Amino acid sequence: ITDPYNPIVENANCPDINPIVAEYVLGNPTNVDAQLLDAVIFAFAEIDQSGNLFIPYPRFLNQLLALKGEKPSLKVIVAIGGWGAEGFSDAALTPTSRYNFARQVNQMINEYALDGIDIDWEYPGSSASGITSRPQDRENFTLLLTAIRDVIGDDKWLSVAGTGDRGYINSSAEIDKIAPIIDYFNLMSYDFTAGETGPNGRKHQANLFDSDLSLPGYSVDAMVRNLENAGMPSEKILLGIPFYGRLGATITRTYDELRRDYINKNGYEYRFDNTAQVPYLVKDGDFAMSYDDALSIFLKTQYVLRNCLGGVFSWTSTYDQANILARTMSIGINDPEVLKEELEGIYGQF
């Protein structure tokens, strides 16, 4: 071994970034471990048919807030939106509608003593999920974010969830204009094969780098670079990691389901794509599942540290009820030497 993979712990080119660890939390938050995390993002507040915010199961939000009893530094954020969530094109449309949305955001912050909000509009200018869209959404989104920041002030968190493909950057968001308004861009660098079938669905959903098993232009690295090139500061990007597997458009499984029923079980076999830097499963000779494991999370957290990004997040905590992946993500940021040592217990010294 002449070329050891020596982990970065602190990047001397950006000391004083203190990258964060977050999880989106969809549903019952019983297993969330605050000790691992800097932030939790409740998913989701909805926009009802009258334009009003709605929280389905408020006790779950309250339970996340109560984690601040154990860890007062924890930030508790509410995400508004999600895939299929209607209401944003209308909310962004006019000075009146933007005021109204911002008013409701701040009322929600005050009601729950939140640390801030995440905006998850999927996506401005696109009706891919069935939601209303308009060609004015991209410019109107900037104005909406300004309306929100103006009301909530500088000392509350504002983030935007989005992607780093060229289409999002050109058609959905004005990256250079939203950058100064937001604290974080939550890069959902996964789901690359959502919407692909046949041979193109039998590809990685979240490969770090390109390989023969990846879709052209779709890699975590490409999305980060596209965002940086479009004017998002590195330190505002949070790199998203899926805690589920995908095969094309039609198959998803939680990490807990993969461990129980798929990984080296039921005819599915583990593989690691050393080029793309992600694991996958094969069955009957075919690519059969794309997911993240401890090794790929080590490599993605090293990418965060090496590239002076703002941090890392998971989608979602409840897909990993034992906090196996969450722990890896947390130590990948905060104690990478321990993660490397653990990995050398499986792969030998590297």
Author numbering: 363 to 712
What do the study's own words say?
Among the most interesting of the discovered proteins was CotE, an 81 kDa protein comprising an N-terminal domain homologous to 1-Cys peroxiredoxins, a central cysteine-rich interdomain region and a C-terminal domain with homology to family 18 glycosyl hydrolases (GH18). CotE is a bifunctional spore-coat protein with peroxiredoxin and chitinase domains that are implicated in colonization. Insertional mutagenesis showed that cotE is not essential for spore integrity; however, in animal models of CDI, when CotE is absent the capacity of spores to colonize the intestine and induce virulence is markedly reduced.
Here, the structure of the chitinase domain of CotE has been determined, revealing a GH18 family fold and, unexpectedly, a peptide bound in the active site. The protein was first crystallized from polyethylene glycol 3350-containing solutions. The crystals belonged to space group P21, with a single protein molecule in the asymmetric unit and a solvent content of 48%. The opposite face of the sheet packs against the meandering segment of the polypeptide following strand β6, which spans residues 550–580. Much of the structure is covalently closed through a disulfide bond linking residues Cys376 and Cys670. The Gly-Pro-Ala segment is a vestige of the cleavage-recognition sequence, with the Met-Lys segment constituting residues 349 and 350 of CotE. The face of the pyrrolidine ring of Pro2 and the residue 1–2 peptide bond pack closely with the face of the indole ring of Trp445. Further along the ligand backbone, the carbonyl O atom of Ala3 forms another charge–dipole interaction with the guanidino group of Arg608. The family 18 glycosyl hydrolases carry a conserved acidic motif, which occurs in CotE as D477GIDIDWEY485. As shown in Fig. 2(b), Glu484 and Tyr485 form polar contacts to the α-amino group of the bound peptide in CotE. Allosamizoline is bicyclic, consisting of a cyclopentitol ring fused to an oxazoline, which mimics the oxazolinium intermediate in the chitinase-catalysed reaction. As seen in Fig. 2(c), the peptide-binding site in CotE partially overlaps with the allosamidin-binding site in human chitinase, particularly in the −3 and −2 subsites. The peptide residing in the binding groove may be an N-terminal degradation product of proteolysis.
